[PDB]
Amino acid sequence: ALKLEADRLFDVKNEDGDVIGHALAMEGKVMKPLHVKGTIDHPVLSKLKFTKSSAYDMEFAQLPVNMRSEAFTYTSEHPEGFYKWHHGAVQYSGGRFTIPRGVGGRGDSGRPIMDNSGRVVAIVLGGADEGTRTALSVVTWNSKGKTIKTTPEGTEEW
DSSP states (O other): OOOOOOSOEEEEEOTTOOEEEEEEEETTEEEEETTOOSEESOTTGGGSOOEEETTTTEEEEEOOTTGGGSOBOBOOOOOSEEEEETTEEEEEETTEEEEETTSOOTTOTTOEEEOTTOOEEEEEEEEEEETTEEEEEEEEEOTTOOEEEEOOTTOEEO
16 A cells, blocks of 8 residues: 555745645645645646635635646535544544644645545634634535635634
C-alpha cells in the first residue's frame, strides 16, 4: 500500500510564506476558504481568476481542463460514525463533525474530511471547543447540490 495519489491538496501561504490553509481540487473546481488571505502555492493555480462566495466562506476557480482528472469526489451522504482527515478520526454525530480538543488550529482550513471510499464529505473552516471535543465549522453540499454552511457558536476560523 504505497500512498501514491494525484495532486489535489495544495498549500495556501501568507506573505512571508507560512502555510495558513489549504486549497483543493474537487468536482472540476479549485476551492479554498475565503477568510484565508494568502496565495495558492502552485504555478498554474495561483494565476486563475477566483470567484468569491462570502455567504459560504468559499472562493473557487475552474480547474484547468488537464487537472480536472486530478480531483476529489464529493458525496452528500454521511451516515453517523467515523470519518477521516489529516489528523486522524473525525466523528459525525448529532448533525456535527467533532475532533478531540487541542488538535485543530491554524493551517487546517481547507482540509477535507473523508469516508473510507475516499470521497470528500466536508471541508473544514474552523472549530468551536465544547467540553472534551471541538465542533467543526464545515462546508457541505446537499443531494441537490446546494452549498450549506454549519458554524457552531463561538467558532474560530482556522
